Amino acid sequence: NADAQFYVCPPPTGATVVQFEQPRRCPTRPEGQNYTEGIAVVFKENIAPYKFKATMYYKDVTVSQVWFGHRYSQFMGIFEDRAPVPFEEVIDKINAKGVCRSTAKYVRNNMETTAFHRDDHETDMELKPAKVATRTSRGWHTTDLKYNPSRVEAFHRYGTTVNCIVEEVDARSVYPYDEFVLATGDFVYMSPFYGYREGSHTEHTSYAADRFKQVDGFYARDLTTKARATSPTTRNLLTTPKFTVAWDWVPKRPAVCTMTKWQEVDEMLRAEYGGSFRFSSDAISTTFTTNLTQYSLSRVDLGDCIGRDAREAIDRMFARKYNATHIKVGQPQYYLATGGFLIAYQPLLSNTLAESVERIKTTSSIEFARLQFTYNHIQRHVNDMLGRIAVAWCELQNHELTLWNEARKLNPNAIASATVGRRVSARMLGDVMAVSTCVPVAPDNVIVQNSMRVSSRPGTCYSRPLVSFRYEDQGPLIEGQLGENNELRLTRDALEPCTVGHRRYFIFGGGYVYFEEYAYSHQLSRADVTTVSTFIDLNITMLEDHEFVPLEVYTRHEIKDSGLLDYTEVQRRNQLHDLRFADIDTVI
Amino acid sequence: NADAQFYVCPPPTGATVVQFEQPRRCPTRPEGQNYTEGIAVVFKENIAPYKFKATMYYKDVTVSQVWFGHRYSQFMGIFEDRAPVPFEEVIDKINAKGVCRSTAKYVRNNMETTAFHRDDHETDMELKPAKVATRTSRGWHTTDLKYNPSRVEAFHRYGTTVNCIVEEVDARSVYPYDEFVLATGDFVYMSPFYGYREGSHTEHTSYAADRFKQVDGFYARDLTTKARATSPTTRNLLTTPKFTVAWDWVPKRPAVCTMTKWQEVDEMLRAEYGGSFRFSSDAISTTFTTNLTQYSLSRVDLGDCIGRDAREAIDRMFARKYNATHIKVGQPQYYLATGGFLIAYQPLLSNTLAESVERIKTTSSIEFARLQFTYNHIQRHVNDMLGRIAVAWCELQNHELTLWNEARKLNPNAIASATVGRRVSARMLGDVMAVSTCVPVAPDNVIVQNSMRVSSRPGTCYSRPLVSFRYEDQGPLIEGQLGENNELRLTRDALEPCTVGHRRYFIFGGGYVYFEEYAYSHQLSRADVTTVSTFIDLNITMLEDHEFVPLEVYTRHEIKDSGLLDYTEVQRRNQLHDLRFADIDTVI
């Protein structure tokens, strides 16, 4: 007790008047974003090589030189070479009959060299299947054993082997498609699209004209089944210095593409704001950003697959999910998104609402677009809910003004003190409130009287306790009456008829003063009285800090290590052989 | 002023009565998600090859042919070959004594060829350490110098070199482990697990039976220290056409695994909703999703490491962090998560409680699971806090009704107008409120009288100003009295005794009208009076838009370029040699 201040308040006068702030104009809900519904196909930069089937035709020519010492034989040398099979032989012997000449006649080191199997006369040898090995393609050959000369004591002799080999191999080529490789690791410096017809003669070739041939209406004969193909092809044949390679010719534009279809999105919402389109997919949790102008497909080099694949996928998705409820609005539109993604977009409309060239470079990481989706999804919800709270809060403040301007007529002192921000006396001057600042009085300078009975006129009593006080620690003593909430009135006018059973508690300092039968009893602290709350609880807690550690499924070291052989390490090791096991400096 | 409407309101009648909406049932704080506490071990698809130590044994056989011209010597040819060391020599000469025969006797090109070092008689040569090189493994050899024939003017002569080489090399194999490679780049077309015992003879082998040998109880002798191993091994030996390779045989199942332990999580919470489990780790900020049914380990090909590694890690983590406060509930459980992660989970409980085969394919990106964790963490907090606000808001609206139904008794006109949404007169008909719509009056049609004194009975005055007005711009003039907030009463009945010091402000149009001693003074604008606010401020602001740009630490081009040599570029360049520096077409 005796900690809270007391106050004496003079009667207010028109010298200072106040009014309550009138209702504020409440904010409006921000208008919801307009989304165009649509179907989309997202394309990425093509990194995969163009793949096709090819067939190699060559003869393994081997010339061994043997020395016949006493009771032992020794190879003095083994010359190994690959000779190309001529076109006449590929067409008239291999494809027509499944045989090869037992001789190899070809140009090597600027000389026309000729080899004969076993050094015998030329004969047509039957091609037969190679021994099976796992994961390899088909192959055929004419000979299993190497031929070596027969013994002649103390002589050096030579023996020739000629094995005609045929192999089906996968061929690979990368943009700009001016050369290709075979599964054997052999390069071919000619475009896989090179030919005579349809302007294909302008494609790249590093070889002389006579090294190339194109056969129209060619029918392949299978070497194992001996069956002839049902339909013809345009067969390309190229004779390199080491082998002849054949493959089916096809037009370039419909075969290759610098873009690859990546995602088919049947629910792609398009929004427009800030001079850009936002294409968001709820299924893949991704948001792409683009300029408002379409990207002309004429800018894409070899982009013919884009329109073709987009139209097929869009029509398929539309038929599967929308044919019964929506319509297509115009033809597909193309947009280039940040990160190098090309989006083919088909806008839709519900039935109920129907009244020079370059290459795009795609990033390897989509995470920026998934963070964009996630941030936008959360931001939109938080801004919506906080916007609703801001509106409701303003409406509540305006609505309660009706209670405040009614309460002020009942107790202007309390309402003025609560709104002005300091203890004041107040009085209504019609429709405005006059105010005056109250003077504080220390709790030590007040004394309550022991009785509320009016001795001067029995049967009448004071409504509130009589009090005695002084403005300063030393000075005159003033007689007054206790008012509401530590108020000290300069007049003893609050009177009532005395009634039996009188019990009262009045606020006195930081506690209460109890009275019975118009006589003092004792002081109390607020803790002595039962407390009930007019407050509605709201337990809001902050979202705690969180630390994201670095995390990878496979480190780049594990990715480098997953390869069975590392060309760099094999070469480093093999080239150290002479430095480890020989002497590169001593001369004899 | 004249910038606001006036109103005349007829006395209400029981024709229209209203009541206040009774307290609404407030929403309940939703029940929190139940979490099982547990320890987890997350496994990913294994991409690393199986690694083991092997030893190669071969002889570098070299036959040089030299021409001895006048005052100069010239190599006419240098034949180089690698011959395998026979099993008898690997066991009885190399491993037993650290020596090799100075001869090489082997099969090449279907012939039994024999070579002698320096063309001398056979002798046992001592193996000695190879010259040191950085980053390479150990190696031994018998000879440093190449042997070339001695000069004989105008003759072609031959000279043989045989260098026995032994090398320790790293071997690698990938699933299904049917072949392996050596650090030299050489392939071995046999499973590293092939053998005779324990059903290992069913493993793959491309070689004839006599090319393989298995020595039980083999003791390796170190070629440098000459020390014999303390414990024996089962030694596999395979003679290929180019070299003999040896390695220790081990059972397949305990050696390889198609899954790899990736993360050990000591605090993995498991929630269940929507027919799926959500495994979340606060430490790695990741949430995995799975079906409710366990994944049977019997489905995993070669998955024996999963149970073994999971049990070891779970027990280790439990001992370190939980032995004093929790218990294990049942045996470890296995669940396959979206993205191809296999989770081994051990449920825990506080001490205070309980009274054909496949290959899993793992994604290289964990970001979907980290976005899932982040979104769930934010969503859960926002839904909790907004849920608490929704509850408190409803509780407050219900609580406030007690003040509203008390305020309506004091001023039914203002309270009815504030709740009905339009200006009306009102009256309490017991426990309901009768209402009637007020007719507007333009401010131009009203005139206030200059005095509030009652001339007919001095000493009495009007409580509020007398007013004169008309309903229409031209029509009869009606005499009345000013009511509250621009109300116009049709009766001059509000009276009081006249008192000295009378000062009053009354609402008049968009401002006030001041009076002194019951006589008019002047009009005022609301801006002329001091304003105090009954409103509690709340400054909510929207979360701004944010653009995420693409960002990579290393682009795939930088990753590709990080390799020292590129096999494709080296081959492309080397195969162009004849097209650049020679003539592949001219014939002489």
Added chain:
Amino acid sequence: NADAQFYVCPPPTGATVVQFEQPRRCPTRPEGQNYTEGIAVVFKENIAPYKFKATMYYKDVTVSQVWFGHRYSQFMGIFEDRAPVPFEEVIDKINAKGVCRSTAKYVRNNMETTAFHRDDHETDMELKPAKVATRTSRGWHTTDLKYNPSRVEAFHRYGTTVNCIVEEVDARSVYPYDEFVLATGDFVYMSPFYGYREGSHTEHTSYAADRFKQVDGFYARDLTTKARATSPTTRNLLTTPKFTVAWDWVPKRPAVCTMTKWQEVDEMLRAEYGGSFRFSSDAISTTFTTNLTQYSLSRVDLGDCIGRDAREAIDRMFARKYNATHIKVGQPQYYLATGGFLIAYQPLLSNTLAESVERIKTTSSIEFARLQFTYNHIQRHVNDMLGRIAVAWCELQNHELTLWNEARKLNPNAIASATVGRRVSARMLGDVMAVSTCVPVAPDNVIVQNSMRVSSRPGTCYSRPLVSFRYEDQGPLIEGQLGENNELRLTRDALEPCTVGHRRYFIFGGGYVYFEEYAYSHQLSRADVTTVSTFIDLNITMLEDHEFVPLEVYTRHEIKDSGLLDYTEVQRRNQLHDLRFADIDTVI
């Protein structure tokens, strides 16, 4: 109707008194995080090889052996070798005059071998440009055609070719830079920084001293234009067993670096909390975390580029964006961030406020730092807005107390019931409220009287309906008067003068009871009366669940397959050749 409890309320007494909870201390808006403004440069671990230009000098020596059979010629062998060009020839013939000797004299297999082009006398041959090929570097050679011996029936003859070749090639080297590779796939076991001067003789070399030479003041002569360089260089020349290689010598430290500049951030904010710095960039949406202590650059092996690049970029960004408005505070600071990113940071200040060695390992994924930025950005906004709502809510609850303690004087029964939480009678005992629990009465035990007229004194009427009731289903019948909200009073004291037009509705059970001219009319349900709401609506909805699926632009299989040739697949296929097309076991 007759579906809600009635209550008999006894007069309260001082046996139980209550007070309202006094205003709570409202929470404070937490102090905002302080941010130091600055410019930053982020460095990552360097993965790119050191690249430099080199020139190879070698002679392609070819010795063919031809057999001249009747009407055909055949190669018996073709020995091919690469011989290094001596220093005297590179300097005095090639660089001085653009010619090579037509002979090759070099050491091979411990013998000094000499070859003569066409077996003719030595002559100086002119180097001329090689035939053009796409994507290859420059090259020169002396000879186009291979030389083969002329026909001599039934003889074996030998022919020598010597083609001097010069090629400009790209050289690559990786840390620790102790060796390098050429574009041809050839390794050089010497540091590219090796030399004599400036302590460079301490660098690695696997070659003998006489195999290396360094020419100071060397002037390169272009082989095509014949023009001599304007400025000299220090030329390194190394003769390996297969070729001579030359390159310009440069000091190591300024040429290589173990770190690479990755991002230049002109707006990097640095915050400090929890004993760590947080460097956030709004432009790249990334937050890096570091310890408070700077990372000493002296710890970085070969880190000289870090200081140089940081100072250049910081000064450039400052000049472009800050020179007119800020100042630099001290020299650049270096901090190592989680994930292995080294941050060079330059603190700034606005003009208005101016009064052994290691190698850092960088993660390939930045996503943890982008999640960190995103989470922090959302968390900070949500905590700010919810913090403001918590403050405003408390301020509102405290402000409303002024209305509550005024309403209790008007209707203590209703206000006590609303705050205590159960139906009670109440009375003000001065400044505290006395309370007493009301006893319930079932609606079935209540009967209303048909008239409100006081028969004993005409002209006077009861203010509220007269009622009859019993406490139990069987017992004495008590006469009383209807109070507020289903209260039953034990005294018929509420009286008024009877007036014309009397109409009233009183709460009776879950409905109302209507009266006219002081006589009963009928009962009504609440639904029969027009309802108006005192509640402010707030429609909060939960943020729905969302599932993030795995998503990748390119799978690791597509990345692996993007390479044109795969060394592992080519070797696997080529080493199977004999197992497929030959017989490795048969002996003849």
